[PDB]
Amino acid sequence: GSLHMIDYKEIEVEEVVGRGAFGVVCKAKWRAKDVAIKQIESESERKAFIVELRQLSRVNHPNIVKLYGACLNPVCLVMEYAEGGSLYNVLHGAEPLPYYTAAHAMSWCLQCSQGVAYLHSMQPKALIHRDLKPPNLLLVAGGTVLKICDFGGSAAWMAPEVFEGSNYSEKCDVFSWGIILWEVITRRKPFDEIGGPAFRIMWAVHNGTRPPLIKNLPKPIESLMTRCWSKDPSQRPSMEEIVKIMTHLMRYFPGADEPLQYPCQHSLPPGEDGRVEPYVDFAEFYRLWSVDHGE
Ligand SMILES: Nc1ncc(-c2cnn(C3CCNCC3)c2)c2cc(-c3cccc4ccsc34)oc12
């Protein structure tokens, strides 16, 4: 239907907690709850907030941040406080990082595709994310439930047709999603080795460069991953196809519901040979798979 009204004086604003694509997001409280709000940096970016609100009023899905309300006091949005921060932090952030498992890796990606597919299926016209990357993916329920935010995006995750200002579509989000699958399995910043300014990744990716292949990555996941990387957007699978495939694969990745609670001391062997090592472990997957099939 449509969104709630929340005057700014009812909100109890606390510290900043991750600047978005254009605005700025902060921790806050509202009516005996924990809440996160975003406000305009300058008045010049008022236009986007009006476009954002009409979209977010329509969206309602478990893998998308639940908007509570808004106002035009200092004009702001009011969301659910994701206790676990962004996925980017979990993967690459502060000194003590959480241990996670292959089950978590796939669960997150599955949940992300469920959200993106909800947006792709939207009527009367589809919503393309464009800016799809871990800093925009948030985690709740002890790191178990993943949620998307910020619609309407560094080069590392951008599909190559977006660089060249060409007639892109929903398939660019699929490319991004492919990169994230590599990122969570390996726990590596994609194209970190290239470095330099953004245009050097864009050149590299535009010429064919993709992240390295992962050692002992099951073929089913490898082919899905590499198909999402297709230079040709039409050769990439729909997000609805990815949701189906991932769902099926989750049978061989039990224990996704276990909260993150174990510390992790990680060297992460930098020596990029031909391939790289996964951070997660696929032994349990091969085991369970072998039980269903032959090998
Ligand atoms: N709704 C949110 N709740 C909590 C956090 C959050 C992020 N970090 N932390 C804490 C977690 C506990 N430890 C300290 C950091 C909480 C965040 C971050 C964002 C966000 C980031 C980038 C773009 C956009 C666009 C709309 S919302 C949003 O939204 C958040």
Side-chain angles (χ1 to χ4, degrees), residues 17-21 25 36 38 65 79-86 89 135-136 138 149-150:
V17 74
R19 279 179 280 282
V25 193
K38 67 177 289 190
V65 288
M79 303 163 284
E80 54 165 309
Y81 180 78
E83 81 266 33
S86 65
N89 283 13
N136 301 356
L138 306 175
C149 63
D150 196 65

Side-chain angles (χ1 to χ4, degrees), residues 66-135:
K66 196 197 285 275
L67 179 76
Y68 293 139
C71 67
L72 214 168
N73 291 45
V75 60
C76 85
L77 276 61
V78 188
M79 303 163 284
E80 54 165 309
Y81 180 78
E83 81 266 33
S86 65
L87 187 60
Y88 190 86
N89 283 13
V90 162
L91 301 171
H92 315 293
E95 250 84 312
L97 302 167
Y99 161 79
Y100 67 89
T101 60
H104 293 322
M106 304 290 293
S107 173
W108 289 330
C109 299
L110 166 57
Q111 286 172 78
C112 178
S113 61
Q114 290 174 131
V116 176
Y118 179 80
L119 296 176
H120 289 4
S121 61
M122 204 86 72
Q123 299 289 352
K125 63 190 176 187
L127 308 195
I128 307 163
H129 195 285
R130 278 83 80 109
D131 212 72
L132 218 208
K133 49 167 184 184

Side-chain angles (χ1 to χ4, degrees), residues 169-180:
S169 73
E170 303 87 5
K171 294 288 166 90
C172 60
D173 289 336
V174 174
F175 186 99
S176 295
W177 182 93
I179 298 298
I180 294 162

Side-chain angles (χ1 to χ4, degrees), residues 39 96 99 119-120 176 214 218 231 248-249 251 254 270 275 278 282:
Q39 284 180 315
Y99 161 79
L119 296 176
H120 289 4
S176 295
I214 304 152
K231 175 167 159 57
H248 296 320
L249 286 174
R251 182 193 171 80
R275 291 169 173 269
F282 291 109

